[PDB]
Symmetry: C4
Subunit: 31 residues, 4 copies
Amino acid sequence: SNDSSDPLVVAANIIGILHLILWILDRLFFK
Amino acid sequence: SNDSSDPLVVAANIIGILHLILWILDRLFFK
Amino acid sequence: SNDSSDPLVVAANIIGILHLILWILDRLFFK
Amino acid sequence: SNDSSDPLVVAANIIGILHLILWILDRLFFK
Ligand SMILES: c1csc(-c2cc(C[NH2+][C@]34C[C@H]5C[C@H](C[C@H](C5)C3)C4)no2)c1
């Protein structure tokens, strides 16, 4: 079942997107 | 149709590239 | 054997995750 | 030929790795 798509690929994309939420927030209060 | 390639993979690459544009800009005015 | 999954994909996810560990730590002592 | 592996996937991993080289350098001179 994981042959079609591995959880690492899905998690990787999710992790990167989540990072943007936190990094973007910091950019909002940039100095 | 999405079996060949999922939109998450394409979006992930696009999101990462876009992040660089914003992060790179900040690096330009580094201090 | 690498046809099923290339090491680049696995390494890419690992590299991104590792980056978060270092970047997250910096955010902890943010100023 | 690109069916086996798309250039976007390879480029994505390369782009992320390259980002670390620049981001890591900044961390070296952290303040
Ligand atoms: C489908 C097949 S391979 C495949 C795949 C995903 C990745 C990692 N992508 C990242 C995109 C952004 C966000 C994360 C760090 C890097 C920039 C690389 C995850 N590497 O390969 C997907």
